[PDB]
Symmetry: D3
Subunit: 170 residues, 6 copies
């Protein structure tokens, strides 16, 4: 997992290592040890609206790799890697400070399904609202809290990827 | 579905017709027509912490049959019937007025797993907290709202079953 | 199953009794006997791109009830009923003569997901192409064959529902 | 469920109403009330090697309808009906006396997969051994016990169907 | 898999690499090659009552790493790692000599669900009885046999972890 | 994944690294990076009739490792390895030239289920016909095409493994 590239051509052509599939049981996996760890069994009765993972060889303003949600037509396996392109970013804050969750779709080479989704406005509204709801509430029953600020666009997402890839010094 | 009895011996020995399994996809089934209808695809990214259905031949102070959640070791099929016994009731309110969701376990004849669960205090705390969280939030993305008041005990649940069975005049 | 209405307000507000879920194992259920029968285990290694069923109290120009595919965000259970609205119809022929498979989305009351899908052009192209492919090929390994003609619009679908409801004399 | 025929042409062409799918979670459904009931959550950590149900309008020497296991390439839904043909019968005894579990395959009209399975010798040995093991052990953790005697052939199965259909007086 | 630590703080704070999820299909995975191998398709129609794996960098009195079952609210993926704490150990014998299967729960950091389970008496009786039944019978249809002796407590489990970690010389 | 052996004893005793399980969702995984990548979401509404992967340290006349389908009683996880033995090979062509898909069963040590399957004639006809159908059609909705030639026997499969293992120079 340490050796997966951030992307073929940052910031628009990235690899996301998926930790948690969309619509899965409430097991919060995290890739550590070179291993898929169980970080927690999520306490709230919720599921991730899209697959959740990160871009390797990035360092977010919060100390871990940059987080990314990837929309797919079928949930992918934990630990699998998906070639993707960013379409937006959700800004938030928690008990540990600021955070952002990018939103991405699979690269055109993987599927024609998202050929008309190029920026955050193109993503179905209900899915965005569900991602917001999830991040507002998923920690409600964990000493952990979350405040969600709002969406920014694909340029802002690409900016996050550039910043975080530059910050990585490993 | 019209012809399923409320129970072998109300209020402590009931039948619950299950509409929605625990931990299922967000399809909100309702038994109508003598049919399992799709009432809605739930908008919020949540799941029912326990199986959800109702007692036939009851009329809740809200116009439909009395609602009951049934804890089981494995989610049951929509449309199946489970012989159960009440252990508590969760009181709430919504856009249509007052409401209550009973909590029950399968009858002893079905499983020895719940032999030590006789009242609401005996139910695992996290499961209660998850049921509360679910009812507080499940309608967040639907013109529909919900305020949750709190738990009452097995006697209060049995009282709800008596009241609702008396109210049924069909 | 005999007693489910064709719809609240034909032709635009219908009920579809689902026989086969989208993306399911290759069991071709049919509602008979008032029962969910197994008609066949499908020989070809394919799945239905959308839920498949029929409108009760209709008689298609082919002798059985009018067939309808219903797009949903999650596959529904066999034997469940979904309130739906037509968006198009796929015309074809087989070893028994002409046939048509309507395409529908859930009624607005069930979900906001399809508020912008009002006619066949609004349906994602790949999904249409997959439905075509499925009907072209699903009988390839069964003495049964199928020739697919092409899509017609929501008005043509509504016309099929009117014709078939009129033809029903039961 | 009361109104499903025993078969198109007994004893070789039967209908089996399935209660429990092959390879399913340990929920022991039974068709009652015209309803799919949960009879028990099975205590032993086992699964049915083949779908399990019964032939309607039969009365086994044990007081309930004749029991039948149906081999299929994919587990079927509880409550569905499968047109089948008998290939053997497993004789046993329990806390309530003698019992027999027929073994059947889907009718040729449903699948070509079993065209070479006409009697008990033709059934894969491991599957037979697993069905034996299951019936020997499934009640180990329930005041209920079971002794398994052995297989008899398709003629003996057909004989069981004739006897049980004659015994039904409802 | 070779490089996963035995634990943060043996013997009470361990890592278990899971090979087989609870309630899964009968595929007996084993971690080898640095790979998840299929060791066998289990012949008996049974499932593991809890997730099954081992502690890395241990050597059991039987030649392979120390075996551990981990109770979780949802089955975890094969190949994932769970931080756990021992609560008991099941002693047995087979065709190759003595053996022991530890029982553990996830560490408090992963879930509050097991805060009241500190020793073997606190584990639900039926689950213990099912684990016993499984180990008594899972090899019934494999030239392989098993005799189960009985449970010992959390101190005995911790003793097994100490012994086995000391024995590892790799 | 780079370090998994081709086999214990080529050509009859091989290891297949599985990329795509039988009967799975249409995610076309490929093992790359030492990683399970998503190569594509398959456009056609089809599934693999048997698990699909490759033999490591082989080079097919087409530039990648030799492809193998492995029949199992339960689909295995992507990324798992199965010890297998060849029973036949399906010859074909595509947009990139000639290709072959071996067919194999698990080694006897893993299961007794295939003890009577030693060559291609012994494999169930419908399964062969489904594998043919799948390879004829799976690329129908992808600028990619496929022409299927026909089956050859277990000796021809073993010949393919010898040729491809010799060709590997890594
Ligand atoms: Na972050
Ligand atoms: Na919190
Ligand atoms: Na209510
Ligand atoms: Na609302
Ligand atoms: Na038709
Ligand atoms: Na045909
Ligand atoms: Na019987
Ligand atoms: Na017993
Ligand atoms: Na051991
Ligand atoms: Na044995
Ligand atoms: Na190839
Ligand atoms: Na093509």
């Amino acid at each position: 997992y340490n050796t997966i590239p951030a992307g073929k051509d940052l910031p628009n052509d990235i690899y996301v290592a998926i930790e948690i599939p969309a619509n899965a049981s409430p097991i919060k996996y995290e890739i550590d040890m070179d291993a898929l760890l169980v970080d927690r069994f999520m306490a709230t009765p919720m599921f991730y609206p899209a697959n959740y993972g990160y871009i390797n060889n990035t360092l977010a303003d919060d100390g871990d790799a940059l987080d990314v949600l990837v929309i797919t037509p079928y949930p992918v396996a934990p630990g699998s890697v998906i070639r993707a392109r960013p379409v937006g970013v959700l800004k938030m804050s928690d008990e540990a400070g600021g955070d952002e969750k990018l939103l991405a779709v699979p690269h055109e080479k993987l599927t024609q399904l998202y050929n008309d989704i190029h920026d955050i406005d193109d993503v179905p509204q209900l899915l965005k609202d569900q991602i917001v709801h999830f991040f507002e509430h998923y920690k409600d029953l964990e000493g952990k809290w979350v405040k969600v600020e709002g969406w920014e666009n694909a340029d802002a997402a690409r900016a996050a990827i550039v910043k975080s890839a530059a910050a990585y010094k490993g």
